[PDB]
Amino acid sequence: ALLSFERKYRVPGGTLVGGNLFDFWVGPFYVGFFGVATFFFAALGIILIAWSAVLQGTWNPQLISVYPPALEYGLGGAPLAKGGLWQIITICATGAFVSWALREVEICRKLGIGYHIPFAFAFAILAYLTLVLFRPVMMGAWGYAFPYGIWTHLDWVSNTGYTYGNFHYNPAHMIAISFFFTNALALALHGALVLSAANPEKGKEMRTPDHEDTFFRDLVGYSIGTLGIHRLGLLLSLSAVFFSALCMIITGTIWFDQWVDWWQWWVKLPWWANIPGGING
Amino acid sequence: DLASLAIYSFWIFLAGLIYYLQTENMREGYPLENEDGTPAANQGPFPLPKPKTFILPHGRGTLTVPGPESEDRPIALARTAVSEGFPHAPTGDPMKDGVGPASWVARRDLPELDGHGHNKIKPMKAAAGFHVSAGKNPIGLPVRGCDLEIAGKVVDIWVDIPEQMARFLEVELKDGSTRLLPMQMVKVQSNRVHVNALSSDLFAGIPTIKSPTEVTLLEEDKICGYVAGGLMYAAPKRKS
Amino acid sequence: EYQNIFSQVQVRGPADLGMTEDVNLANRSGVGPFSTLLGWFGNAQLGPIYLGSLGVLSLFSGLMWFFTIGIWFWYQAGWNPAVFLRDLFFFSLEPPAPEYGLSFAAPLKEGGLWLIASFFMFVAVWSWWGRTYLRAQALGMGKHTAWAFLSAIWLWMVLGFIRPILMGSWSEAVPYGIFSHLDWTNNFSLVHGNLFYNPFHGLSIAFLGSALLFAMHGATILAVSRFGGERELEQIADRGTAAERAALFVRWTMGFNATMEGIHRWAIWMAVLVTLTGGIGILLSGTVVDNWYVWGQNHG
Ligand code: BCL
Ligand code: BCL
Numbered sequence: 001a002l003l004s005f006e007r008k009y010r011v012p013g014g015t016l017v018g019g020n021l022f023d024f025w026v027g028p029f030y031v032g033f034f035g036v037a038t039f040f041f042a043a044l045g046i047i048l049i050a051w052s053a054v055l056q057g058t059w060n061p062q063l064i065s066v067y068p069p070a071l072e073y074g075l076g077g078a079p080l081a082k083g084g085l086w087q088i089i090t091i092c093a094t095g096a097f098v099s100w101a102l103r104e105v106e107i108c109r110k111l112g113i114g115y116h117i118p119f120a121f122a123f124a125i126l127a128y129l130t131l132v133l134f135r136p137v138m139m140g141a142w143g144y145a146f147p148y149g150i151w152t153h154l155d156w157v158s159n160t161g162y163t164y165g166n167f168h169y170n171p172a173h174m175i176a177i178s179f180f181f182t183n184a185l186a187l188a189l190h191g192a193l194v195l196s197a198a199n200p201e202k203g204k205e206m207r208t209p210d211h212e213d214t215f216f217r218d219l220v221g222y223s224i225g226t227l228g229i230h231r232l233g234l235l236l237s238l239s240a241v242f243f244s245a246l247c248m249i250i251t252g253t254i255w256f257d258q259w260v261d262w263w264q265w266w267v268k269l270p271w272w273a274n275i276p277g278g279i280n281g
Numbered sequence: 282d283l284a285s286l287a288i289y290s291f292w293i294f295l296a297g298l299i300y301y302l303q304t305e306n307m308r309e310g311y312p313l314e315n316e317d318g319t320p321a322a323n324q325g326p327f328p329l330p331k332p333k334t335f336i337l338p339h340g341r342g343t344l345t346v347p348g349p350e351s352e353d354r355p356i357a358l359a360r361t362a363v364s365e366g367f368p369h370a371p372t373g374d375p376m377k378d379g380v381g382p383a384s385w386v387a388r389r390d391l392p393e394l395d396g397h398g399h400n401k402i403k404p405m406k407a408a409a410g411f412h413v414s415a416g417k418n419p420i421g422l423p424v425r426g427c428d429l430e431i432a433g434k435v436v437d438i439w440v441d442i443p444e445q446m447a448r449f450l451e452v453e454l455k456d457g458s459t460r461l462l463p464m465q466m467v468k469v470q471s472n473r474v475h476v477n478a479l480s481s482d483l484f485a486g487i488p489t490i491k492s493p494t495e496v497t498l499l500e501e502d503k504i505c506g507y508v509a510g511g512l513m514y515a516a517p518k519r520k521s
Numbered sequence: 522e523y524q525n526i527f528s529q530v531q532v533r534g535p536a537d538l539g540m541t542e543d544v545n546l547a548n549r550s551g552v553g554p555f556s557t558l559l560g561w562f563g564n565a566q567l568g569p570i571y572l573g574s575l576g577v578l579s580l581f582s583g584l585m586w587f588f589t590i591g592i593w594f595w596y597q598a599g600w601n602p603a604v605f606l607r608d609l610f611f612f613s614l615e616p617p618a619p620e621y622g623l624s625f626a627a628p629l630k631e632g633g634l635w636l637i638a639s640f641f642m643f644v645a646v647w648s649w650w651g652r653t654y655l656r657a658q659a660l661g662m663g664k665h666t667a668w669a670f671l672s673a674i675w676l677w678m679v680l681g682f683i684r685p686i687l688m689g690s691w692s693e694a695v696p697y698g699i700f701s702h703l704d705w706t707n708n709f710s711l712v713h714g715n716l717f718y719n720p721f722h723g724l725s726i727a728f729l730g731s732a733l734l735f736a737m738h739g740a741t742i743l744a745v746s747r748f749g750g751e752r753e754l755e756q757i758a759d760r761g762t763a764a765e766r767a768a769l770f771v772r773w774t775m776g777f778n779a780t781m782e783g784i785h786r787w788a789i790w791m792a793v794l795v796t797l798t799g800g801i802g803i804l805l806s807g808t809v810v811d812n813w814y815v816w817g818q819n820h821g
């Protein structure tokens with residue numbers, strides 16, 4: 001059904017492929033050519049998960065796991081039973097993720113709005129492809145990619161990390177974590193600021209953006225503004241994911257020893273490298 | 282044990298939270314409607330919330346949501362199919378008629394005020410001490426359409442005083458009237474302002490404002506809706 | 522196609538002294554300068570700031586905490602500036618050895634200095650908290666920032682105060698060091714049998730959920746700023762097409778609905794739930810649960 005204000009916006013057009021063939025809705029959902037492709041890649045993918053669970057011998061959601069090929073398979077294809085399914089599924093998952101993004105472009109065009117959302121979404125699609133495609137290829141085996149299972153994908157995180165000692169010492173991991181931590185701070189403030197102004201003390205009128213800017217200046221001496229906090233939120237979370245892909249593309253490719261040891265370049269700078277005392281020497 | 286208790290209690294809290302959250306986001310646009318505007322039979326799982334009332338500043342009354350929703354304007358669209366789900370073709374000019382990406386909403390026909398009660402947006406000629414402080418000053422540059430033709434010249438910048446940002450270019454057309462262009466829909470260049478959404482012959486069609494020194498919320502929507510509509514509707518006149 | 526990530530033009534007027542309301546204008550500084558650099562992304566104006574008793578109190582013991590750690594760092598560097606810079610990330614100010622329990626009798630060079638700096642930190646933060654509340658109160662605003670801040674105070678309180686007290690010694694607390702506090706973290710998980718089995722850590726991570734939300738939200742408001750969408754408060758009082766199209770994006774995309782106010786409640790909760798659930802999972806680690814792998818083997 002339709003929101004009270006919605007009919008005036010459901011006009012023909014904005015499609016990228018197909019013209020007016022799939023230009024329609026199903027309940028609230030816009031379909032479009034990439035609505036259909038999403039559904040196709042998604043349903044093909046889910047069928048293959050369930051097949052993988054048949055061969056594995058379990059129907060328990062906390063036990064289904066679809067592993068990549070072994071390392072000795074390098075970058076070739078493996079049999080379905082032993083890593084082939086992961087290969088086909090990974091193709092499907094990508095099919096569905098890009099069709100999702102392209103379908104959002106179409107929704108944007110119909111609505112006359114900017115393309116910022118699919119653009120932001122592509123960065124998450126980037127990160128996924130780093131872990132399942134770009135990193136395995138540079139290393140030379142699909143087996144370095146993570147498995148598709150709820151708890152087993154976590155065991156991969158923990159094993160991969162500890163191959164390099166305390167992964168905390170990856171400098172790109174550090175920056176990535178800062179951006180994640182800051183984005184949440186920023187989000188909490190942005191949410192609290194709007195609500196605190198729309199929902200003032202009992203009996204008082206709605207505050208204004210003047211009150212929002214006054215509050216930040218009184219608090220920290222600077223207010224970034226209402227347009228700028230939205231730029232800030234977009235930028236922080238996009239950078240967070242960017243440096244995540246970065247900390248992972250370099251790990252095991254250009255750097256493969258323990259990450260704590262990478263920091264000896266600083267300590268071993270020649271002008272202070274032998275001054276006694278302190279922690280190092 | 283105590284940790285099982287903690288995690289069980291949390292999911293129960295989390296569920297009522299999602300429910301609370303889900304119903305706060307029903308305060309605009311409900312109840313759902315059929316395509317002919319009658320109320321839908323299936324309104325979804327969650328009920329509507331007990332209404333809240335905002336006290337608007339500066340003596341402008343209240344707003345209570347959810348409350349009765351009327352588009353408060355005519356919609357020039359016909360059905361293209363015998364069943365739900367399909368587009369609604371425009372019966373006239375969608376740019377003139379304000380449907381599709383050219384849509385506007387019937388907001389108050391008053392200007393947004395700042396915290397002191399003054400007009401929020403003012404032509405810079407009326408905004409004491411305001412000036413362009415960085416970037417290229419567009420005033421005096423000529424405005425170009427997507428058809429690479431010159432529709433007008435920029436005669437002023439309309440500025441948000443409390444937020445100190447440019448919000449509209451005031452463009453003078455060839456008959457001597459002006460129009461407002463959304464600042465987010467133009468590209469200031471060294472020798473020109475370029476408007477990708479409109480071809481030159483659509484500038485005269487931009488909605489005009491009542492008073493020369495103020496712009497109301499209705500007027501802002503009609504202008505902005507019109508200029509975004511050209512991205513779809515003007516497209517038979519855009520070079521690359 | 523202009524995309525609104527940076528302003529093309531900057532305009533400037535007289536410095537804005539801000540809303541008055543119930544504020545005490547005596548305690549507002551003068552307006553600082555205008556940063557054009559900042560003005561390509563947000564506002565150019567710096568200041569004025571508000572500083573009162575709680576301001577100074579906070580700001581003073583905040584500096585006292587900072588200096589105390591740096592003093593101990595210089596000690597460790599043997600007062601040599603070259604060693605100080607070389608090993609800046611490696612110094613650390615640790616808590617008292619488990620022997621001293623929850624007592625304050627620990628010598629300075631053996632944990633007493635930790636307890637001092639921690640005291641200043643305790644005062645600086647709780648001061649600043651009451652500062653977020655009283656700054657809102659003076660403008661007549663909701664106390665949403667003070668309650669969201671509490672969620673971050675919760676996790677910080679748990680890590681360095683509540684949980685050490687419950688475990689019966691200060692040694693359980695976090696040290697003051699760059700690499701030093703990274704190791705404490707890794708250690709903590711190893712000892713409690715992998716946190717990845719602490720279901721509050723797992724939710725905490727889900728909420729952290731917030732990069733996703735704030736990506737969507739910022740992208741959307743920029744996408745609809747051609748209709749003046751960044752102006753969310755008046756869009757709440759008087760819905761315009763900016764709010765209409767942003768609602769219809771999420772509805773046509775994934776079928777759920779979001780109002781201009783409604784989505785800021787998603788935002789504040791998505792964010793506060795990070796540190797809230799995180800604090801519970803740390804609070805239970807070692808006090809109630811010794812080993813999350815072993816706990817996960819009985820599901821409870
Ligand atoms: C023992 C474990 C190690 C360690 C090892 C690793 C390893 C190994 C990795 C990380 C990575 C990350 N770690 Mg680390 N890390 C540790 C400690 C930490 C700590 C901490 C407090 O100590 C923190 C905060 C972090 C933080 C982070 C981030 C920087 C990053 C994860 C975000 C990301 O990539 O998103 C990216 C987001 C995605 C990939 C999601 C994409 C979603 C797709 C596009 C859409 C899917 C839809 C889906 C199918 C659902 C539809 C369902 C419904 C039907 C709709 N690590 C410890 C020391 N860390 C990872 C990273 O950087 O990856 C690039 C990584 O590989
Ligand atoms: C990003 C860096 C690491 C990684 C490290 C971690 C760590 C560490 C943790 C998780 C956690 C989770 N991870 Mg993982 N994870 C990675 C990549 C992924 C990918 C992917 C790229 O396709 C997916 C789908 C998941 C999925 C998940 C969920 C099971 C869970 C909550 C996520 C969440 O709230 O996100 C934020 C998103 C939202 C709030 C939006 C809604 C998302 C919904 C809930 C997704 C459900 C997906 C469903 C189970 C997938 C299959 C559906 C198919 C059609 C069959 N991870 C990589 C390898 N992940 C946490 C957990 O509890 O795991 C048990 C946890 O502690």
Ligand code: BCL
Binds near residue numbers: 705716726799800
């Ligand atoms: C090997 C390490 C272990 C591990 C050990 C821990 C431990 C131990 C903890 C976490 C915690 C967290 N971990 Mg873990 N973690 C691991 C792997 C991961 C991975 C992953 C592999 O991908 C991820 C994504 C995460 C993610 C997370 C976060 C959800 C969570 C911290 C929330 C937060 O915002 O803290 C940052 C925010 C704060 C610390 C609050 C600070 C608030 C105060 C008031 C700020 C004061 C600042 C001060 C005044 C400085 C002044 C500033 C200047 C004036 C400018 N972990 C593995 C399994 N992780 C924490 C948690 O919640 O656990 C449940 C925690 O304690």
Ligand SMILES: CC[C@H]1c2cc3[nH]c4c(c3C)C(=O)[C@H](C(=O)OC)c4c3nc(cc4[nH]c(cc(n2)[C@@H]1C)c(C(C)=O)c4C)[C@@H](C)[C@@H]3CCC(=O)OC/C=C(\C)CCC[C@H](C)CCC[C@H](C)CCCC(C)C
Binds near residue numbers: 100
């Ligand atoms: C870039 C910043 C953050 C970001 C942003 C972002 N995410 C987005 C968007 C944006 C801007 C959207 O527009 C889009 C959306 O619609 O949001 C509601 C989306 C979205 N982000 C999602 C998830 C998601 N985002 C995450 C993260 C991030 N999203 C980043 C951190 C994570 C994490 C951290 O793990 C997840 C799980 C979805 C809710 C949605 C995209 C939905 C979608 O693509 O649907 C198409 C596909 C299907 C319906 C089914 C695919 C099934 C596969 C073929 C089989 C399954 C294979 C898969 C590998 C199984 C893996 C499971 C195991 C790991 C358990």
Ligand SMILES: COC(C)(C)C/C=C/C(C)=C/C=C/C(C)=C/C=C/C(C)=C/C=C\C=C(C)\C=C\C=C(/C)CC/C=C(\C)CCC=C(C)C
Binds near residue numbers: 587590
């Ligand atoms: C340039 O050199 C000088 C000296 C001039 C200045 C330089 C200073 C330097 C180098 C500063 C460096 C600071 C660093 C590296 C700080 C790092 C801090 C980190 C990483 C902190 C991380 C976590 C901290 C936590 C969790 C703290 C928790 C503390 C509490 C909850 C306080 C609890 C209170 C206690 C225990 C005592 C309370 C007392 C009473 C009486 C109630």
Ligand SMILES: CCCCCCCCCCCC[N+](C)(C)[O-]
Binds near residue numbers: 220221550552553567
């Ligand atoms: C102190 C916490 C962070 C402060 C941020 C810096 C901006 C403050 C500017 C105010 C300065 C005004 N004045 C007159 C002192 O110059």
Ligand SMILES: CCCCCCCCCCCC[N+](C)(C)[O-]
Binds near residue numbers: 561
């Ligand atoms: C808080 C982050 C601050 C980032 C601001 C720095 C941006 C510099 C100017 C960017 C573009 C300016 N220019 C010339 C293209 O108009």
Ligand SMILES: CCCCCCCCCCCC[N+](C)(C)[O-]
Binds near residue numbers: 719720723724727
């Ligand atoms: C605001 C609520 C958003 C939905 C919450 C998403 C929950 C998925 C996380 C599942 C957590 C799994 N775990 C580890 C706790 O068992």
Ligand SMILES: [Cl-]
Binds near residue numbers: 238239242
């Ligand atoms: Cl970037």
Ligand SMILES: [Fe+3]
Binds near residue numbers: 194742
């Ligand atoms: Fe917002």
